[PDB]
Amino acid sequence: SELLVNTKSGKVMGTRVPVLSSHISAFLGIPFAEPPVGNMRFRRPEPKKPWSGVWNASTYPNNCQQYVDEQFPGFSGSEMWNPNREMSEDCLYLNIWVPSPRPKSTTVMVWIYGGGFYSGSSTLDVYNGKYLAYTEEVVLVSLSYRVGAFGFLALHGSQEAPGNVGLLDQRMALQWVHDNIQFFGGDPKTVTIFGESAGGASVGMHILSPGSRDLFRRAILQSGSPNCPWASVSVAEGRRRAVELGRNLNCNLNSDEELIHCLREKKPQELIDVEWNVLPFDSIFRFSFVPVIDGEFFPTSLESMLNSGNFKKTQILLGVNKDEGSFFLLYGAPGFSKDSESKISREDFMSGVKLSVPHANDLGLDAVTLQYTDWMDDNNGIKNRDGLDDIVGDHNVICPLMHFVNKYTKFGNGTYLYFFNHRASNLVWPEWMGVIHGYEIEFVFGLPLVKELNYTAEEEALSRRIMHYWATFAKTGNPNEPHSQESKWPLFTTKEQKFIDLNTEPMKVHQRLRVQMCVFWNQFLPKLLNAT
């Protein structure tokens, strides 16, 4: 009854799940397209054909095929991001958490997982929607989408591997929500899409793309934006990386059809095993198969679209973490270790700069080095470590997002900007990594409300604050409740550029979120690289 819902594609049967001291309804693993298997690998997706009978939606679905991290086997801090279900190309499913009793037409939030467009799962423990759905009385959806070559192999001109099909994956999920969430008590006119990392870039890409704009109301972007240097490639570079994938696998390279046909004959893991080999440079924070600027999903360049106001005009809430770079340095740069303070020698600093700005010429590398080096104290291993951390975070996350924020706000209908800088009391990663890429998510999804996870009382309060900000924004376009006695998160405006810190302390309002280095990253360095 409460758990039996007839959708436009067929009947589904959910399950009743405990949440804190109560219960809510969960519909897990609902299919929203045809399995993209066999001759449909790399292809645009197709809607799921209606089914007879009742779809058992009591269990999480498979995860999409992806690279699996084995750097720290068994370590909870890294394994919490790996697939926790069987991987399969049959992975295009969504999950829904619905308050009990079912509401009539309440606000909908659709989570888009990140993972650099190469990884991610809707089923991770940290994305369990039940705490946010129960606490804030929202219908919480998490979608899925093909990652890696399966979602973003791009041979422009081919209709068999056109590129961006993972983005199209997200779109079909949003269209399914548009068509069916009313049967779960959700309001299809009040859908907020939100995501972190590539999910945040994705949210911004749907703001940009005409084919996506009418499928949601407003948007939240966490540590990601559509213009990030890692988040897209040209059609030429996408073509080069697809051909190099075939070269790594002894494919016929004479035509797209023969290349695609060879690649479609490979087992999924054969593609994954050579995925990182197609990158052009030794690099960190760079991923092989990402969205392409194609002229279809993206009509023109992202920058021209941002400049002209060619995007959805609505409210946005977005922000970054204090130490976005540390995860990438730990996994990919010399001198960093999970088990030490990772003081960085001058030599390893210079190596890290090269890995962090792989596209830069030697003059550009000199510019980055001078901007982030204290020449009164150039052998200070802690300053070198933190300087490289800032380089990676500023170049890859913060400065692209601030460029996006400033362009969007010229045309949009309300911007709210945050700086998340709380290090969790129970973090398993070392202190030099600070406030890590991905580690605001557990606060957004309410994990500190679970006493067994051993968060502090202040962290539970912070999680409750953030969930209420996110959900009140989703409901109203404004994270603040009116007539409330709590300090107000101010609008970000072109003139005053205000933002708040998010942490356990009373709110602080600041202005011009890191403005100096982003002048460097957004105006000076691109001009230097374009001149030289």
Add this chain to the structure above:
Amino acid sequence: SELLVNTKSGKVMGTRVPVLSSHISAFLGIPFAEPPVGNMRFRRPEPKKPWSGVWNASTYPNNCQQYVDEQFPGFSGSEMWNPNREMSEDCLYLNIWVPSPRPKSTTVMVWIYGGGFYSGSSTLDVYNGKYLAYTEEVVLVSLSYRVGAFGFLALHGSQEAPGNVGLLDQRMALQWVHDNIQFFGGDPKTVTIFGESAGGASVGMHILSPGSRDLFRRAILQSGSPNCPWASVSVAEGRRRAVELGRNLNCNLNSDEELIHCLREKKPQELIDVEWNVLPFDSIFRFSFVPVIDGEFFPTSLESMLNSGNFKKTQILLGVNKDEGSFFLLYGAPGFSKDSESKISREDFMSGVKLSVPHANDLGLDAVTLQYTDWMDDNNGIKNRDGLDDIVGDHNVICPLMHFVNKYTKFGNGTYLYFFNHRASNLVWPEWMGVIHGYEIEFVFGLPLVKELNYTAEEEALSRRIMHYWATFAKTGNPNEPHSQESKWPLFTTKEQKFIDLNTEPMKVHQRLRVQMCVFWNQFLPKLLNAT
């Protein structure tokens, strides 16, 4: 007797002058070259032909022909630098102060005035040698040299106007000191040359030039160095400026001989009136007629001589003032005034950057602007004013000197570096100009010892503090007296790069003088300009 001295060129009669509550001997206006007049204009100097009878050396000589500042008529702060004697091309004379009674063979210090190679006089009140000669028991010489076109018009390949003849004037005076100072109680083997601004650059040029090296023992450079961007031009640029001078005066331009013949017919003021017109850019801290890198006075480029160690190996003492740029902004840049705090708008800041780095392309100007702009507070008129002040001082004085210091110290036999940052209590210039280009000179020459000039007692001590450093360095190659236990001025070394502040407070040792900005000026910007 004490005032009657037989030199190798003839007899001279000096005069007994009061100094504080005592007396010393002064020999003023001794000729060291033939008057460079008529056909001799622009020509290398020729030794003064010996005279019969007694040369009357009781009176200051004429000053060389030069541009005279009329910006602030009658204002003591600027008038103190103007010629205080009649100007004449018959101006190649030197002055000597000798302790009374005459010493046997004491240390000699030879002052070389500055003035951007376009101005300067040996006879200014602030260069009165009597306090230094009396207080420190040295023989103090001040020389003179042709400035402007008269000293530095350069038509390379012509022997009639070869360039660098003002430097050859200095050398001829040093040769005269070498040959004659023993008759005044000076030791020709212990001569220190010292100078400020262009005089400091000149001192460095004599260190470089093979034809000068044997005419002095060691060297002091104040707020100037041979590699300063204003201190030399190429033979091609000197030729362009000489031809343009002729163009301004309707000269025949078909040949060097015809051009020179024309310029020699003009009255001196006719040349001076158009002198600034030959500069290639709207600019500040750039001067028309300066030393040329000719392959004769300078055998190769300054940088290659410095890299190869092709220079005199001895001890040097040198330094800079806190606010070298302020004078040039007051006189040449928009928004500055003697009668206001000169808060600088953003627009006037950008204009000032362009005037300050006239040779830079737009990418270069962007780099300078980013390096000196606080983008959290870019409309702060005090920060804009002080940022421009630092740009002018760093680019033109401090960083070129630090480059020289660094290169010299690899091969030299002892470097002592200072940072003079005391603002005089009785300064007539406004507070925003800080510690001004030229305003350490009055301390070096002992003017705070004169009660009627109204320095504080701490400023008298500092002046005594500086005169003793300078004269002890001249005597021994080390500014510190041994077995004294005043705090010691450490050697500047390649590794530790120590320097001292010079001010009324107890001496503090620091390291790496303006190292951050000088990486920009000495390494990154030249690379950027070369590559773009």
